[PDB]
């Protein structure tokens, strides 16, 4: 198969700690504001060994395409220039992002019918829960 338990269109159901997460990420007040207006739909899709996550909103349409284990450059939603590496372990996708000597983790896994994304920075954890569209 491949990475097939993540594939689909996902819609945000509940967010918690995300603004505080971005405070720890070092994101400025104005950007934190815009970032918390948007409640994007996450759209996942896999071709061969390349996975794609498309956060698609009115304000911003981002899209990362990654080979898995291979380092790629990313511009994050909040306007960071990052180097990311994505790993699959224990049924979970672990994305690490590094920039200006800093590192954060975005772990995406299934619970049951839902997909949970946790972002972690210096012991602030954000938790967003998506369900299927």
């Amino acid at each position, epitope marked *: 198969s491949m990475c097939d338990a993540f594939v689909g269109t996902w819609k945000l159901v509940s967010s918690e700690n995300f603004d505080d997460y971005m405070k720890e990420v070092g*994101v400025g007040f104005a950007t934190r504001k815009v970032a918390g207006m948007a409640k994007p739909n996450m759209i996942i899709s896999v071709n061969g060994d390349l996975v794609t996550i498309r956060s698609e909103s009115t304000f911003k349409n981002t899209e990362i395409s990654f080979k898995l284990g291979v380092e790629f450059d990313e511009i994050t939603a909040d306007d960071r220039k990052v180097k990311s590496i994505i790993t699959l372990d224990g049924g979970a996708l672990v994305q690490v992002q590094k920039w200006d000597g800093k590192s954060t983790t975005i772990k995406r896994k299934r619970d049951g019918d839902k997909l949970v994304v946790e972002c972690v920075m210096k012991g602030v954890t954000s938790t967003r829960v998506y369900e299927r569209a």
Partner: antibody
Amino acid sequence: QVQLQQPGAELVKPGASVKLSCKASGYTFTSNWITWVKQRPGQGLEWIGDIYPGSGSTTNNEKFKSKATLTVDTSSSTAYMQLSSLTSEDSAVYYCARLRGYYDYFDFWGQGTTLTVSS
Amino acid sequence: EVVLTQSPALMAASPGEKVTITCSVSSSISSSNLHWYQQKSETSPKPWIYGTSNLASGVPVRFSGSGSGTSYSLTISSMEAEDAATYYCQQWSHYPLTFGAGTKLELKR
């Protein structure tokens, strides 16, 4: 290139109102916050507000609540700040600037518009 | 409100000389949201250093920026005549957005 255009100078009588412009170009307009800064002669820099073109949502200084009101027209690619109930205290240079996301610093600035309120 | 206090309000330096301004904060900010601008002759101020230490496009290499918790600073390694100007730090980690009052840098003679 990235550029915000403001008229050079404006003359308005006391008690009247005035609406100032910041015309943008060289980048996608709705992707960046636009801020307004007031500077009087001799004195330093004063922040009025931010507006997000594309949403029109604002962040504002509590010191300028009555005075200033921020809006945009995306069709024109313009930002506007309206001042009202004008006094001599409003004679200053007004800078609009494009804000740069994460970090949130002002990378591009319009020349000021020198507002003069006088009889 | 995060109050930014900038030390020497007024400063004179002769070409060649090392120069340090401080921007000192009343409470904690994220180093990524502390910025310096340089203004000449009250025309449009210019971005100089962003995120404490980054340094804007076309800003010379003699300039650098530093920071830590209580204080941030701007340093010129060697003064040039064109560096005489008024330099404001500014903060956007927390509402409201604040400025410091500036330090004017004049040429010493």
